[model samples]
Every structure is written in structure tokens, then in C-alpha cells.
Target: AEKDCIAPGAPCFGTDKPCCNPRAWCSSYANKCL
Candidate 1:
């Protein structure tokens, strides 16, 4: 478990599962990412 998700413009890993960007947060929904 690394905080690498908190990087600038990086893959934002959060409670949101498949998510978006812009220092936002993980999309706590269905498939997204990629």
C-alpha cells in the first residue's frame, strides 16, 4: 500500500473504485480507470 496514488496527475487511488483525475479521487463506482 503506497501513497503513490497521491502523486500529481497520477493515478488517484481512493475510496472511489473506477475513477477520474485532476487530483480528484477514485470513482467509488463500476469500472473506469484506464
Candidate 2:
């Protein structure tokens, strides 16, 4: 039950790579973008 769990150009889970927005978190898990 989640929306877009991933962002465009962001690294997918299970990979050691980091996200474009390193501090990004799912809206479901976080209240704001840091």
C-alpha cells in the first residue's frame, strides 16, 4: 500500500547505489523532504 516508492533516476533498492536526493524518504514514512 504505497505510491511511487521510487523517484525518477533514483537507484533502486537492493543496490548499493545512492538516491539522487540522498535524504529522500517515502511520504508514507516521512512527513517532509529534507
Candidate 3:
């Protein structure tokens, strides 16, 4: 649960990881990530 990622691009929580969140998100693909 409390393991990794606090940087804007790092996943908040998951396996494959994800960028962005409540205020922002991935641009239009898995890249250009926010």
C-alpha cells in the first residue's frame, strides 16, 4: 500500500504504474505522460 512513488510521474499505486491523477492525466497515450 505505502510502498512507492510520490513524484508526479510515478504511479500512486499499481503494478505497471500510471501517470497523472485528480488534477492531471496521461496526455493521449501511455506516453507523453502528462
Model 1 off-target regions past 4 Å?
1-5, 14-34
The C-alpha lDDT values of all candidates are 0.41, 0.41, 0.43
lDDT of 2 at 17: 32
The list of candidate 2 runs beyond 4 A from truth reads 1-4, 15-34
Better of 1 and 2 by TM-score: 2
- Where does the lowest 10-residue lDDT sum fall in candidate 2? 25-34
Give the TM-score of each candidate: 0.22, 0.24, 0.22
Expressed as tens digits, the lDDT of each residue in 1-34 for candidate 3 is: 4434234654434344445354555443434335
Cα-based RMSD of candidate 2: 8.2
Between the candidate structures 2 and 3, which one is better when assessed by lDDT?
3
**In candidate 1, what are the lDDT values of residues 1-34, reduced to their tens digit?**
5353444444544434323445455532422243
User: Model 1 has how many clashing residue pairs?
Assistant: 5
Number of the predicted model whose TM-score against the real structure is largest? 2
